[PDB]
Amino acid sequence: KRQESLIQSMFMPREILRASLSDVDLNDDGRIKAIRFAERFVAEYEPGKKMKGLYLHGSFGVGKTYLLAAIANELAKRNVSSLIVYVPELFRELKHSQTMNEKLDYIKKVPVLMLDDLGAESWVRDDVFGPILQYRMFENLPTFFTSNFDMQQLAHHLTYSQKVKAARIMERIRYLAYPIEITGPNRR
Amino acid sequence: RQESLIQSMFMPREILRASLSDVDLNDDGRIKAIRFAERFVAEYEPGKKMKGLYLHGSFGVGKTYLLAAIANELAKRNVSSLIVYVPELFRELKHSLQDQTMNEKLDYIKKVPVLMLDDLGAEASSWVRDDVFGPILQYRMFENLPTFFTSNFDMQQLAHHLTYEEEKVKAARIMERIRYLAYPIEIT
Numbered sequence: 001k002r003q004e005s006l007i008q009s010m011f012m013p014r015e016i017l018r019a020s021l022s023d024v025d026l027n028d029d030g031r032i033k034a035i036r037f038a039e040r041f042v043a044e045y046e047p048g049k050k051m052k053g054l055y056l057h058g059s060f061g062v063g064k065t066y067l068l069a070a071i072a073n074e075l076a077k078r079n080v081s082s083l084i085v086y087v088p089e090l091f092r093e094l095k096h097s098q099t100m101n102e103k104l105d106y107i108k109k110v111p112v113l114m115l116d117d118l119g120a121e122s123w124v125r126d127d128v129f130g131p132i133l134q135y136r137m138f139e140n141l142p143t144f145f146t147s148n149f150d151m152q153q154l155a156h157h158l159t160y161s162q163k164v165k166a167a168r169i170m171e172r173i174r175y176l177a178y179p180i181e182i183t184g185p186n187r188r
Numbered sequence: 189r190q191e192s193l194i195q196s197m198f199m200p201r202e203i204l205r206a207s208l209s210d211v212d213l214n215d216d217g218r219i220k221a222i223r224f225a226e227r228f229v230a231e232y233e234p235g236k237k238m239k240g241l242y243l244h245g246s247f248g249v250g251k252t253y254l255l256a257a258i259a260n261e262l263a264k265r266n267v268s269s270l271i272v273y274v275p276e277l278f279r280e281l282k283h284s285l286q287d288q289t290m291n292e293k294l295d296y297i298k299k300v301p302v303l304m305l306d307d308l309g310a311e312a313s314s315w316v317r318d319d320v321f322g323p324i325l326q327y328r329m330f331e332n333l334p335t336f337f338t339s340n341f342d343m344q345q346l347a348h349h350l351t352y353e354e355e356k357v358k359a360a361r362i363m364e365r366i367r368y369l370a371y372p373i374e375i376t
């Protein structure tokens with residue numbers, strides 16, 4: 001349907017938004033636990049409710065991003081808007097840029113936010129990414145993520161120094177989402 | 189043998205009859221190309237996220253041939269590749285987005301498993317660079333589809349080349365993409 005019309009998207013092709021939580025197979029634990037969580041989230045969702053999102057991590061091509069698109073489609077089926085952001089592209093358009101701040105605002109404020117592909121390529125990110133996360137915590141705005149790295153690795157990954165604050169941001173994330181590993185074949 | 193898998197666009201197919209053995213590692217720049225190549229083929233898998241080669245050097249060296257070689261070793265192992273003579277496409281593009289199919293050609297090149305763009309530079313324009321070219325690179329970055337290049341110029345010279353400030357930034361976001369996609373190897 002016009003489901004896709006309610007699903008906003010930044011820096012990523014809209015054709016990947018052709019997804020459904022019914023096309024995902026039961027094959028293993030990762031997804032069984034994931035969509036089970038997803039559907040409970042989508043059923044119980046209501047503006048302004050402490051609610052944990054998902055932090056999906058795993059190898060390349062297991063269907064992590066598709067899971068987010070899938071969840072967004074379920075929500076648009078509830079007439080709730082969400083936004084999926086290819087994050088690596090968000091941090092880049094931020095270095096080379098007319099307008100962008102009006103959009104960070106939209107990101108911090110959307111009902112449900114899905115940050116795709118966290119973790120690939122101190123730092124100014126202490127001013128941009130953290131605040132976003134902190135605003136969604138403060139306002140009870142559900143937040144999802146997809147990374148190739150898990151909680152342990154992601155920290156070790158963003159901008160290594162010779163600090164702790166990277167670990168402070170790692171805290172907002174696990175506060176915001178419940179991590180689940182997605183195993184399975186390499187769909188490609 | 190392995191030629192029905194690797195195809196081309198805008199260049200007589202008799203140029204793609206190559207081999208990594210038909211070459212002689214004469215002077216070093218070349219040594220790391222062949223090495224990069226074998227590494228690439230051995231560790232290649234869809235969605236992987238792996239650099240390609242950006243080979244730069246003066247006229248009559250072997251940039252094109254090398255690509256064809258890598259393209260052949262890749263066929264020896266199943267993988268289909270696609271090498272396109274860039275200057276032709278851009279030239280062609282000038283007037284062709286007019287009602288029709290060639291753009292479904294642009295669509296296929298954007299989505300192929302391995303893209304090899306022969307001799308970038310050596311002419312061309314801006315809505316094409318930044319609207320035709322750019323999106324190609326941005327898509328293949330997001331999907332982690334291997335991309336190779338060959339240019340008479342080193343990265344720093346291909347940028348100052350494309351400038352014809354604000355287009356300073358444009359050559360910037362576009363050069364950033366090439367770099368993120370290919371590791372530069374000088375040849376002589």
Ligand SMILES: Nc1ncnc2c1ncn2[C@@H]1O[C@H](COP(=O)(O)OP(=O)(O)O)[C@@H](O)[C@H]1O
Nearest residue numbers: 023024025059060061062063064065066067187
């Ligand atoms: N559950 C699924 N049902 C049908 N297609 C799927 C499913 N999951 C992933 N895909 C397909 O696989 C591809 C995406 O895998 P991807 O979302 O990129 O994994 P990452 O999200 O890389 O783990 C898409 O092009 C999509 O067509």
Ligand SMILES: [Mg+2]
Nearest residue numbers: 064065117146
């Ligand atoms: Mg992904």
